[PDB]
Amino acid sequence: IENGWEGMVDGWYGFRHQNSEGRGQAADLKSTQAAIDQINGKLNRLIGKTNEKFHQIEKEFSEVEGRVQDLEKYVEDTKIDLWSYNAELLVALENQHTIDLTDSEMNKLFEKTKKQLRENAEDMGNGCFKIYHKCDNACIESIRNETYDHNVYRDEALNNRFQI
Amino acid sequence: IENGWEGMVDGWYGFRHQNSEGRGQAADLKSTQAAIDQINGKLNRLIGKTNEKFHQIEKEFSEVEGRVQDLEKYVEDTKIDLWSYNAELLVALENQHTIDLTDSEMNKLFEKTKKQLRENAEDMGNGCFKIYHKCDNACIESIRNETYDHNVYRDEALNNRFQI
Amino acid sequence: IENGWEGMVDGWYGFRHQNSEGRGQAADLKSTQAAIDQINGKLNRLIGKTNEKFHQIEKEFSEVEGRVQDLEKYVEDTKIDLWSYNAELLVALENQHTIDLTDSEMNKLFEKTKKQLRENAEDMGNGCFKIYHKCDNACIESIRNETYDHNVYRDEALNNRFQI
Amino acid sequence: ATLCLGHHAVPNGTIVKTITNDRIEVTNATELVQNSSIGEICDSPHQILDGENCTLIDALLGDPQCDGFQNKKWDLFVERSKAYSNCYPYDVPDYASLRSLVASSGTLEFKNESFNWTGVTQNGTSSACIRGSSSSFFSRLNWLTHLNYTYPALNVTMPNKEQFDKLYIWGVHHPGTDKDQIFLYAQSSGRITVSTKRSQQAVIPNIGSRPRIRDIPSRISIYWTIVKPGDILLINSTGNLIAPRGYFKIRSGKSSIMRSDAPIGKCKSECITPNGSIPNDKPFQNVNRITYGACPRYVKHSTLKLATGMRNV
Amino acid sequence: ATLCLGHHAVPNGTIVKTITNDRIEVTNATELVQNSSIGEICDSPHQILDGENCTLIDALLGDPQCDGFQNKKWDLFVERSKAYSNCYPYDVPDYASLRSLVASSGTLEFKNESFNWTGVTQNGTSSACIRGSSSSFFSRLNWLTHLNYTYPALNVTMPNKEQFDKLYIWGVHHPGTDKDQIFLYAQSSGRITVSTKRSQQAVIPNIGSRPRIRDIPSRISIYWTIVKPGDILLINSTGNLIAPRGYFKIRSGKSSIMRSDAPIGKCKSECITPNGSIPNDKPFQNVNRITYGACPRYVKHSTLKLATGMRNV
Amino acid sequence: ATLCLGHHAVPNGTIVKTITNDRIEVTNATELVQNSSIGEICDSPHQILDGENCTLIDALLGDPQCDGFQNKKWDLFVERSKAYSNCYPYDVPDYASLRSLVASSGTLEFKNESFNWTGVTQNGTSSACIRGSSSSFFSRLNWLTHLNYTYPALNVTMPNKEQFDKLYIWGVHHPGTDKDQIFLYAQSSGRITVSTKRSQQAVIPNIGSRPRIRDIPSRISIYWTIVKPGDILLINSTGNLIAPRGYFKIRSGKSSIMRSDAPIGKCKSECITPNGSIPNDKPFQNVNRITYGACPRYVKHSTLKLATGMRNV
Ligand SMILES: *[C@@H]1O[C@H](CO)[C@@H](O)[C@H](O)[C@H]1NC(C)=O
Ligand SMILES: *[C@@H]1O[C@H](CO)[C@@H](O)[C@H](O)[C@H]1NC(C)=O
Ligand SMILES: *[C@@H]1O[C@H](CO)[C@@H](O)[C@H](O)[C@H]1NC(C)=O
Ligand SMILES: *[C@@H]1O[C@H](CO)[C@@H](O)[C@H](O)[C@H]1NC(C)=O
Ligand SMILES: *[C@@H]1O[C@H](CO)[C@@H](O)[C@H](O)[C@H]1NC(C)=O
Ligand SMILES: *[C@@H]1O[C@H](CO)[C@@H](O)[C@H](O)[C@H]1NC(C)=O
Ligand SMILES: *[C@@H]1O[C@H](CO)[C@@H](O)[C@H](O)[C@H]1NC(C)=O
Ligand SMILES: *[C@@H]1O[C@H](CO)[C@@H](O)[C@H](O)[C@H]1NC(C)=O
Ligand SMILES: *[C@@H]1O[C@H](CO)[C@@H](O)[C@H](O)[C@H]1NC(C)=O
Ligand SMILES: *[C@@H]1O[C@H](CO)[C@@H](O)[C@H](O)[C@H]1NC(C)=O
Ligand SMILES: *[C@@H]1O[C@H](CO)[C@@H](O)[C@H](O)[C@H]1NC(C)=O
Ligand SMILES: *[C@@H]1O[C@H](CO)[C@@H](O)[C@H](O)[C@H]1NC(C)=O
Ligand SMILES: *[C@@H]1O[C@H](CO)[C@@H](O)[C@H](O)[C@H]1NC(C)=O
Ligand SMILES: *[C@@H]1O[C@H](CO)[C@@H](O)[C@H](O)[C@H]1NC(C)=O
Ligand SMILES: *[C@@H]1O[C@H](CO)[C@@H](O)[C@H](O)[C@H]1NC(C)=O
Ligand SMILES: *[C@@H]1O[C@H](CO)[C@@H](O)[C@H](O)[C@H]1NC(C)=O
Ligand SMILES: *[C@@H]1O[C@H](CO)[C@@H](O)[C@H](O)[C@H]1NC(C)=O
Ligand SMILES: *[C@@H]1O[C@H](CO)[C@@H](O)[C@H](O)[C@H]1NC(C)=O
Ligand SMILES: *[C@@H]1O[C@H](CO)[C@@H](O)[C@H](O)[C@H]1NC(C)=O
Ligand SMILES: *[C@@H]1O[C@H](CO)[C@@H](O)[C@H](O)[C@H]1NC(C)=O
Ligand SMILES: *[C@@H]1O[C@H](CO)[C@@H](O)[C@H](O)[C@H]1NC(C)=O
Ligand SMILES: *[C@@H]1O[C@H](CO)[C@@H](O)[C@H](O)[C@H]1NC(C)=O
Ligand SMILES: *[C@@H]1O[C@H](CO)[C@@H](O)[C@H](O)[C@H]1NC(C)=O
Ligand SMILES: *[C@@H]1O[C@H](CO)[C@@H](O)[C@H](O)[C@H]1NC(C)=O
Ligand SMILES: *[C@@H]1O[C@H](CO)[C@@H](O)[C@H](O)[C@H]1NC(C)=O
Ligand SMILES: *[C@@H]1O[C@H](CO)[C@@H](O)[C@H](O)[C@H]1NC(C)=O
Ligand SMILES: *[C@@H]1O[C@H](CO)[C@@H](O)[C@H](O)[C@H]1NC(C)=O
Ligand SMILES: *[C@@H]1O[C@H](CO)[C@@H](O)[C@H](O)[C@H]1NC(C)=O
Ligand SMILES: *[C@@H]1O[C@H](CO)[C@@H](O)[C@H](O)[C@H]1NC(C)=O
Ligand SMILES: *[C@@H]1O[C@H](CO)[C@@H](O)[C@H](O)[C@H]1NC(C)=O
C-alpha cells in the first residue's frame, strides 16, 4: 500500500475498485469495527479509571524544617518521577501497539482478499489486486461480503493470467 | 484456521488429514516443543523468583501518632499501589505476548507446510491445504517429518491444479 | 533463511547471487538504513537522557538512630529495587523488540523481492529465490535497485517454471 | 479488473510518540493529560468547608471570627491563603500533626463535659479576642486564673465510658513577665501535667516576652491528648492552664485539608485540586500534585497523546 | 488429498487479561497471586521465638513470666496479641525505636558487668512482679534505693574495651507522691544524666500519680544508650535510677518482629506472614503486606492469571 | 538464476536478555550500566570545595584549621573521612538537619552585625582552639563571660529589614563543674531563650562532666534559628551563651554535601559520585547510590546489555 485515501469516510479500512461500470469505493465494516473495538477497549481500560485518595503527606512547604522535610519531599518526588516514567512508557507502548495493530488489521484484510480470490488475482506492490476475471460490481461486492466463489471464475481467469 | 481440535492431546499444534486410506491426526512435536519452551522460559523468569527482606517499616498501626505515621503509611501505600500497577501491566504484556506467540508458532507451521509443498498445494481459508497429488499416508508423514520432496510430485500435481 | 553471511560487511541486510557471470554479494542499503535508524532512535531516547538531582536524603548511615532511619533506608531501598525492575523490564522489552525488528525488516526485504519478481520466482525454504529467467547481473542489480520489471521476463520465465 | 485495499487518511493528523520514533503522524489522538482546571471548586459530591479566613486550628479553638464553624463536618476543609487569626496569639508544637489529626477526623463535633474546675476562677478573657464588641476568648478553651488570690492545685479525673475516642485540646500560658504570672495565677511559677494510662505529657511554662504580635508579648501553647474507651483523663495543674471545656470526637475517615484560593461554585465533580475541580476522565494530570478524591495521577509531562487512529498518509 | 493444520482446544478453558481485551479464553493459566496461607507459622529454616505472652520489651527487661527468654536468639520474634506484661508498669519514650533496635539485633544475649553501685542499696523489689511467689523485679534492671537514709551521687565509668557495641538499658523511676520519693531515695528530687563521648541524655523524674494500673499509680521510664568500642559509659545519678546490670550485645543482622496469633507448627517454609507461612513460588501475594523472608510482592489484585496455554476454541 | 537474501553475521557476538529467553546471541550490544568511575572528582562544571579536614559544620563555626573557608560558595561540598575537628568540642542536637540546611544553602557568606553584648565580657577563648599559636575560639561565635563578676541578663532585639532570611548560629555552654560555671559566668545556673514571632527555643545548660575529649570534660551545644524579613530576633540570656557575631545568608538552591575520599582533579564532568566523577551517557549505573548532578539511575544489576545488532549466526 503506497498511500491512504483522503476521501474514505465511511470506515477506516476499505476497498476501491476499477471495472467497466466505473470507479468507486466503500468501507469494509468488519475490518473497521474490529480495529475500533480493540482501540476502544484499550481506552476503556485507562480512561475513566482513577484511584481515590483522601489524606496524604504535605507536598508544599513554606518553611525550613530539616531532615523530616527533606524526606517528605524526596518521597513525593520519587513517586512523581516514577509515575511520569510509567506514563511515558505506557503511552509509547500503547501507541506502538496501536500503529502495529492497525497495520496488522490491514494485512489481515489483504490476506482475506487473496485467500478468497484463490489464484484469480495477483498481488501488486501498490497494495492492489489485479483480478484476472473481467468482473463488474457483483464480484466486488461478493468479495467485500465474503461470498466470492473462486470456483466460478478460475476457468476464465487462469487463461488470462498464465496462458495469456 | 476456523476452530480448534478438541481431540488433539499429544501436542498443542498438529496436523489432521484426509486421504484414501482414512482420516486421522497427529501432533507436530517440534512446533509444540518450541511453544512450550518459550512459555516455560517466561514462567521460570518470574515464578520462583522472589527477593528476601528482613526488617521493614511498620505497616500496621493501632494509635494516632501524627505526621510521622502519615508518611510511613503514605510510603507503604505508594509502594503497593505502584507494584500492583507493575503486576497488572506485566501480566497483561505477558498474556498479550503469549497469545501472539502461540499464534505466531501456528503461522510458522502453516508457512513451513506451504514452503515445503511448493506449488503442490493451495491455501484454503479454513487453515487447510488442498494437496493436488493424490497422496496416501507416506506424503503426510514426510510433510510432518520435513522430508517432503516437491520435485517428486509437481509433475503430477500441477496438471490437476492448473491444467484441470 | 538458514544462516547468516560472515563475509557481508557493507550493510546488515543484503543479497547474494549465483548466475552465469559468477557468484557475489552486496548490501541492500535501504533495508539496512531503515534498521539502523530505528535502532539509533531507540538508543537516542535512552542514552544521554538523565535527570538532574541536587539534594537528597542520606543513603549511608554509620550510627543507630531508630525508626526515622528505618524509614529513610526503606524509602531508598524501595526506590532502587523498583528502578532495577524498570531497568530490567525495559531492556528485555527493548531487546525483544530489537530482535523482532530486525527480523521484521528481513521479512520485508523478502516480500519486496517476491512482490517485485511477480511469478518469476519461487520461495525456497532456505531464504533464497529461485528465478526462472536466466538473468545475468543486470536483473540482479535491477531487483536490488527496485526497477525490475516482471513484464519483461514472465513470457520466458513461466515456461521454465510450470510448463517445464 | 482492479481491486485496491487501503486506509483512510486525513488532511491534518496529529503527532504521537512510539517506542521506535518520537514523531509519527496519526489521524486522531486523545490527550491523556488534563491540563486546565475549571478554576473553581465544585460543591458536590463532596462536602466542602470554605474556611473564609479560618485556619482549621482557629476553627478548632473557636476564634471570634470562626464561630460559624461550630460542630461542622467536612470531607474537605479548605484554607484560604488570606486567613489570619484574630484572637490571642498561639504556638502549637508539632502544628502539622494536630492539623492532620483534626483534618482527617473530619469534624469539629464537640461536647461539653462537667469538668470540676473548683477553687479557681473560670472564663478569663483578653482584649485580643473581641466578639460582640467585648473582650472574650477562644470558645473551646477555659482560661483559669486564681480565685481570691489562690490557685490550688487542680486534679480532674474525667473517665471515658463511651465507645469512642475523646480528643482533648488544652494549652499552656506563657505570661510576658513575672508580674503578669503572679497577677493572673497567684503563683511564682506554674506547671502542668496531663496523663492517661498509656502516656504522659508535661509542660513547664516559659516566662518572658516574645516580639509583640497584635501588641501582645505573651503567648499560649496548644497541646492535645487522646483518651481511649476505658481510660481516664487525668489533669493536674498548679497554674498557667488553659483548660478544655469538653472533647472533640475523632472519627476514622476520608477527610482532609487543602490550601486554595479558588472560589467554591455550583458544580458536581469528584477530583479537587488547589486550582479548583478537574474533570477526572483522563488518567494523568499536570495541574498540581495536591489532590483530593478520585483524581488522575500527577506527571511532569506536559502532554501525552495516545493514538486512537492510525498512521496517517 | 487434504492436510489441515490447527491447535488443540479444551472443553473448558479459563479467562485471562491482555492489553487489548480483558476477557480472553485460554487453555490453562497459572494463578500468580498466592491467596491462602497455610494457617500456621513453619518452624524452619528460620529460627522463631513464639513469644507466649512476651512483648520483645518484656523479654528484654526480664518480666517474671518471660524468664525463659534469657539469652535467646532469633531470626524472627513473634508477638502474640494476647501478650500483657505482669510486672511493674513502664513507659518507653520512642518505644518503637527501642523495639526495632532490639528486634534487628536478633538477640537477648546479655552479659553482667562489675558495676560499682556503692553507697546505695541494690536489688529493690515490688509486689507488682511476682516470681516464685515472692516480690521481685525485672531481671535485667537494678533498682537502687537509699542505704542508711543516704543516696550519694553515683558516678560509674564503664569503658568499652571490646570489639563490639554495647547496648545499655536503664530507666527512670517516677514515684507517685513526694512521700514515696523521699521514702525510697532520701532525696526531695532526683536527676539522671547518662553520657558517652558522642552524646548525652538527661532525664528529670516526674513526681505525681497517673491512673492506677495493676493498682500502681507510679511508673518507670525506659531509656537506652549505645557505647562504641573505645568509648566510656558514664552514669551520674542522684536518685530515681533503675540501673543496668550489664549490657546487651548488638549485632547487625537479618532479624525482625512480626505480630501474629498464628500457632507455630512443624514445617519448612521461607516466607512468613502474620497469617502463617506462605509457599513462595508465585511472584505476588495478597495475603498481607507484612512479610519476612524471600516472599512474593504484595499486590491489591485478588487475581492475576498468566496464560500458559493459548486462545481456546 | 538464484538470488539469496540474508543477514550479516559476526565471528563472535554477545549475549543479551529478551522476554522469552535469557541468553540470545547478538552482533553488538551497548552496555547500559556504567560500572567504573574515573577515580577522581572532576573540578568543573560544578564548583566543588575539597573540605581538607573540614566538616561543613567546622567550616561553619570557624574551626582554627578551616579559616580558609570563610565566605565560600559551592555547588558541592565534599567531606573527607579523615576530617576531625581541632577546637573546643561540640554537640549539635539534630546535627543532620543543620548540616542539610547549610549544605543546601550552598554558602558560608556571612555578615557581621552590630550586636549590643553590653555589661559582659566578649571574646572568651580556650586552649582547645589554637590559631597562630595562641588560644582562640571559633571565629563565628562570641563566647560571653562575666564582666567585673557580673553577668546581667542580656536582651538583644536584632530586626530583619532586609529582603532575605537570616540564619543565626548560636550555642549553649555546658561547664564541667559548678566551679567552672561560677568562674566563667558569676551565676550558679544559667538559662537561654531565643525567639522570633513564629517560634521559640529554650535551653537549660547541663552542668557535669562528660568523658574527656582532647582533655576537655565540658562541651558546647549548637542551636540555630531563622529570621524571616519583617521579624525580630530576640535573644535573652542569663549565662552560658555562645553568642552569634552576625548571620549567614540562606539561599534556596542546588547545592549539597557528599562524603568522599576521592581527590579532585582537572576534568569536566556533570555526574559526581563518592567514587569520583562518572560519564553520564549510560542511563544506569551501579557504582553507588549517592550521586550529585545529571546522573544515571542506580540499579542493582551488574550488567544490562541492550542489543544494537541482531540475532547472530
Ligand atoms: C454480496 O453482494 C452481492 C451483490 O450485492 C449480493 O448479491 C449477495 O447476496 C451478497 N451476499 C451477502 C450474503 O452479503
Ligand atoms: C518420514 O516419514 C516417512 C513415513 O513414515 C518415513 O518413510 C521417512 O523415513 C521419515 N523420514 C524421517 C527421516 O523422519
Ligand atoms: C539499476 O541497476 C541497473 C544495472 O546497474 C541500472 O542499469 C539501472 O539504471 C539501475 N536503476 C536505478 C535507477 O537505480
Ligand atoms: C477522536 O477519537 C475520539 C475517541 O477517543 C472520538 O470521540 C473523537 O470524536 C475523535 N475525533 C475525530 C477527529 O473523529
Ligand atoms: C491541554 O489539553 C487539551 C486537550 O484536552 C489541549 O487542547 C490543550 O492544548 C492542552 N494544553 C496544554 C498547553 O497542555
Ligand atoms: C475575611 O477577612 C476580611 C478582612 O477583614 C473581611 O473583609 C472578610 O469579611 C472576612 N471574611 C469573613 C466573612 O470572615
Ligand atoms: C466536684 O464538684 C462538686 C460539685 O459542686 C463539689 O462539691 C466538689 O467540691 C468538687 N470536687 C472537688 C474536685 O473538690
Ligand atoms: C463560664 O462561662 C460558661 C459559658 O460557656 C458558663 O457556662 C460557666 O458556668 C461560666 N463560669 C463561671 C465561673 O461563670
Ligand atoms: C478571701 O480571702 C480572705 C482572706 O483570707 C478571706 O477572709 C475570705 O473569706 C476569702 N473569700 C471571700 C469570701 O472573699
Ligand atoms: C529576660 O527574660 C526574663 C524572664 O524572666 C526577664 O526577667 C529578664 O528581665 C529578661 N532580660 C532582660 C534584662 O530584658
Ligand atoms: C527586652 O526588650 C523588649 C523590647 O521591647 C521588651 O519588650 C522586653 O520586656 C525586654 N525583656 C524581655 C523580657 O525579654
Ligand atoms: C496550579 O497551581 C500551581 C500553584 O498555585 C501553579 O503553579 C500552576 O501553574 C497551576 N496550574 C494551572 C493549570 O493553573
Ligand atoms: C497448566 O500449566 C502448568 C504449567 O504452569 C502445568 O504444570 C499444569 O499441569 C497445566 N494444567 C493442565 C490443565 O495441563
Ligand atoms: C487463590 O489461588 C488459587 C490457585 O492457587 C485458586 O484456586 C483460588 O480460587 C484463589 N482464591 C481466591 C478466591 O483468590
Ligand atoms: C499466657 O497467659 C495465659 C493467661 O494467664 C496463661 O494461661 C498462659 O499459660 C500463658 N502462657 C504462657 C505459658 O506464658
Ligand atoms: C569501687 O569498687 C571497690 C570495690 O569494693 C570499692 O573499694 C570502691 O569504693 C568503689 N569505688 C567507688 C565508686 O567509690
Ligand atoms: C543483688 O542480687 C544480685 C543477684 O542478681 C546479687 O548478685 C547482688 O550481689 C545483690 N546485691 C545485694 C546488695 O545484695
Ligand atoms: C547509719 O547512720 C547512723 C547515723 O548517722 C550512723 O551512726 C551509722 O554508722 C550508719 N551506718 C550503720 C552501720 O548503720
Ligand atoms: C498534682 O501533682 C502533685 C505532684 O507533686 C501533687 O503534689 C498534687 O497534690 C497533685 N494535685 C492534687 C491536689 O491532687
Ligand atoms: C488526684 O486524684 C487521684 C484519684 O484517685 C489520686 O490518685 C491522686 O493522688 C490525686 N493527686 C494527684 C497526685 O494527681
Ligand atoms: C491476613 O490477615 C489480615 C489481618 O489479620 C486479614 O485482614 C486477611 O484477611 C488475612 N488474609 C488471609 C488470606 O487470611
Ligand atoms: C556497536 O554499536 C555501537 C552503537 O551503539 C557502535 O558505536 C559501535 O561501534 C558498534 N560496535 C561494532 C562492533 O561495530
Ligand atoms: C563495565 O562496563 C564496561 C562497558 O562500558 C565493560 O567493558 C566492563 O566489563 C563492565 N564491568 C563489569 C565487570 O561490570
Ligand atoms: C589535614 O590533617 C592532616 C593531619 O594533621 C595534615 O597533615 C594535613 O595538612 C591537613 N590538611 C590540611 C591542609 O588541612
Ligand atoms: C546599646 O549600645 C549603645 C552603644 O554604646 C549603648 O549606649 C547602650 O548601653 C546599649 N544598650 C543596651 C542594650 O543597654
Ligand atoms: C572581640 O574581638 C572582635 C574581633 O572579631 C572585636 O571586633 C571586638 O570588638 C572584640 N571585643 C572586645 C570586648 O574586645
Ligand atoms: C568593679 O566592681 C567594683 C565593686 O563593686 C566596683 O567598685 C567597680 O566600680 C567595678 N568596676 C571597675 C571599674 O572595676
Ligand atoms: C554528678 O554530676 C554532678 C554535676 O553537678 C556533680 O556535682 C556530681 O559530683 C557528680 N557525681 C559525682 C559524685 O561524681
Ligand atoms: C566522675 O568521674 C570522672 C572520672 O574522671 C570525673 O572526671 C568526674 O569529675 C566525676 N564526676 C562527674 C561530674 O561526673
Ligand atoms: C563505590 O564506593 C562504594 C563505597 O565506598 C564501594 O562499595 C563500591 O565498590 C565502589 N564502586 C566502585 C565501582 O568503585
Q: Do A123 and C115 touch (CB under 8 A)?
A: yes
3 state SS of D16: strand
The arrangement of secondary structure in B65-160, i.e. its CATH architecture, is: Alpha-Beta Complex (3.90)
Rg (CA), chain C: 27
Determine contact, residues A5/D7, Cβ cutoff 8 Å. yes
**C129 exposure class (CB count in 10 Å sphere: 0-12, 13-18, 19+):** buried
Residues F8 and F128 in one domain: no
Solving technique = cryo-EM
DSSP code per residue over C54-96:
---------S---HHHHHHHHHHHHHHHHHHHHHHHHHHHHHH
Residues D80 and D96 in one domain: yes
The cell numbers describing E276, all together, are 502463617
The cell numbers describing C36, all together, are 539502523
**Type of residue numbered A15:** F
The cell numbers describing C57, all together, are 536524603
Rounded Cα distance between D142 and F26, Å, is 80
Determine contact, residues F39/F78, Cβ cutoff 8 Å. no
Residue C84 touches partner B, C-beta closer than 8 Å: no
Residues F37 and F57 in one domain: no
Q: Which residue's alpha carbon is nearest to atom 3 within ligand 17? A: E123
DSSP code per residue over B89-153:
HHHHHHHHHHHHHHHHHHHHHHHHHHHHSTTTEEE-TTSEEEESS---SHHHHHHHTT---HHHH
DSSP state of F274: T
The last residue of one of the domains, among E218, E239, E257, is: E257
Residues F205 and F304 in one domain: no
Q: Which residue has the cell 486410506?
A: B21
Domain that holds residue E37: 1-43+264-313
Q: Do A101 and E20 touch (CB under 8 A)?
A: yes
Determine contact, residues B133/B139, Cβ cutoff 8 Å. yes
- Ligand 29 midpoint to CA E240 (Å): 20
Q: Do E271 and B50 touch (CB under 8 A)?
A: yes
What Å distances lie between residue A65 and B67, C136, E242, F164, F224, CA to CA?
13, 83, 35, 17, 12
Residues F137 and F117 in one domain: yes
Phi, psi of C142 (to 5 degrees): -65, -40
Q: Do F19 and C134 touch (CB under 8 A)?
A: no
Question: Which CATH number fits the domain that encloses residue F187?
Answer: 3.90.209.20
Q: How far is CA D285 from the centre of its chain?
A: 25
Q: What residues of A are in contact with residue B93 (Cβ under 8 Å)?
A: 93
Question: Which CATH number fits the domain that encloses residue F32?
Answer: 2.10.77.10
- Ligand 13 midpoint to CA F57 (Å): 64
For C128-139, give the secondary structure using H, E and C.
EEEECCCCCCHH
Residues D16 and D122 in one domain: no
Residues β-bridged to residue D136:
D126
Rounded Cα distance between E49 and E77, Å, is 5
Residues F230 and F192 in one domain: yes
Q: Do D193 and E211 touch (CB under 8 A)?
A: no
**D138 exposure class (CB count in 10 Å sphere: 0-12, 13-18, 19+):** buried
Fold type of domain A14-48+59-160: Hemagglutinin Ectodomain; Chain B (3.90.20)
Residue F99 to chain A, least CA–CA distance (Å): 9
Residues F122 and F223 in one domain: yes
Q: Which of F110, F118, F123 to mutate to test the pocket of ligand 26 (most atoms within 8 A of CB)?
A: F123
CA angle A118, A120, A125 (to 5 degrees): 95
Tell me, using a 6 A CB cutoff, whether residue E28 lines ligand 13.
yes
Rounded Cα distance between F220 and F143, Å, is 10
Residues D170 and D213 in one domain: yes
Rounded Cα distance between C121 and B143, Å, is 22
Resolution number, Å: 3.1
To 10 degrees, what angle do helices C67-116 and C29-46 make? 170
Tell me, using a 6 A CB cutoff, whether residue F282 lines ligand 22.
no
Q: Chain B: residue nearest A80 by CA?
A: B78
Determine contact, residues B129/B15, Cβ cutoff 8 Å. no
For chain E, give the secondary structure using H, E and C.
CEEEEEEECCCCCEEECCCCCCCEEECCEEECEECCCCCCECCECCCEECCCCCCHHHHHHCCCCCHHHCCCECCEEEECCCCCCCCCCEECCCHHHHHHHHHHHCECCEEECCCCCCCCECCCCEEEEEECCEEECCCCEEECECCCCCCCCEEEEEECCCCCCEEEEEEEEECCCHHHHHHHHCCCCCCEEEECCCCEEEECCCCCCCCCECCECCEEEEEEEEECCCCEEEEEECCCEEEECEEEECCCCCCEEEECCCCECCCECCEEECCEEECCCCCEECCCCCCEEEECEECCCCCCEEECCCECC
Residues E274 and E252 in one domain: no
Q: Which residue's alpha carbon is nearest to atom 9 within ligand 11? A: D209
Residues D107 and D190 in one domain: yes
Q: How many domains does chain E have?
A: 2
Residues E181 and E58 in one domain: yes
3 state SS of D225: strand
Find the distance separating the first CA and the last CA of chain B, reported in whole Å.
27
Closest partner residue to E96 (CB to CB) among C64, C65, C67 is: C67
Determine contact, residues D193/D200, Cβ cutoff 8 Å. yes
Rounded Cα distance between F120 and F154, Å, is 9
Q: What residues of D are in contact with residue E219 (Cβ under 8 Å)?
A: 200
> Which helix (DSSP H) or strand (DSSP E) does residue A46 occupy?
helix A29-46
> Which helix (DSSP H) or strand (DSSP E) does residue A16 occupy?
strand A13-18
Q: Which residue has the cell 550510627?
A: C63
Q: Chain E: residue nearest D194 by CA?
A: E210
Q: How many CB atoms lie within 10 A of CB D178?
A: 12
Closest by alpha carbon to F166, among F67, F247, F85? F247
3 state SS of F160: coil
> With b meaning 16 or more CB within 10 Å and e meaning fewer, what string describes D195-234?
bbbeebeebebbbbbbeebeeebbbbbbbbbbbeeebbbb
CA angle E237, E240, E241 (to 5 degrees): 60
**Type of residue numbered D68:** G
Q: Do B119 and C124 touch (CB under 8 A)?
A: no
